[PDB]
Symmetry: C2
Subunit: 57 residues, 2 copies
């Protein structure tokens, strides 16, 4: 019971950190999207920079 309880406590710890890994996986994925979008914009803003800068020229 104590070992199983330890296993359960260990799983509870694990579920908090598994959930944390998942929160971080989700944040990572959100951030990965934000990265492709932040970089998309870095590039798009530069694409637009050139479109407008070209017009500026």
């Amino acid at each position: 019971e104590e070992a199983e309880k330890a296993a359960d406590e260990s799983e509870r710890g694990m579920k908090v950190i598994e959930s944390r890994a998942q929160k971080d996986e989700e944040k990572m994925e959100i951030q990965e999207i934000q990265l492709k979008e932040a970089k998309h914009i870095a590039e798009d803003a530069d694409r637009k920079y050139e479109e407008v800068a070209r017009k500026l020229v």
Copy 2:
């Protein structure tokens, strides 16, 4: 032995998961850093866009 093993599976679970959760925290932090760098590129790419777009106006 199965319960202690379960404790060890759950504890190993935590070691792998905690380390993984940290790897995910790091990948997440990396995506945060990268999206922020990309976002900052976007802040400047957009800022530069604004400067040329404003200058275009």
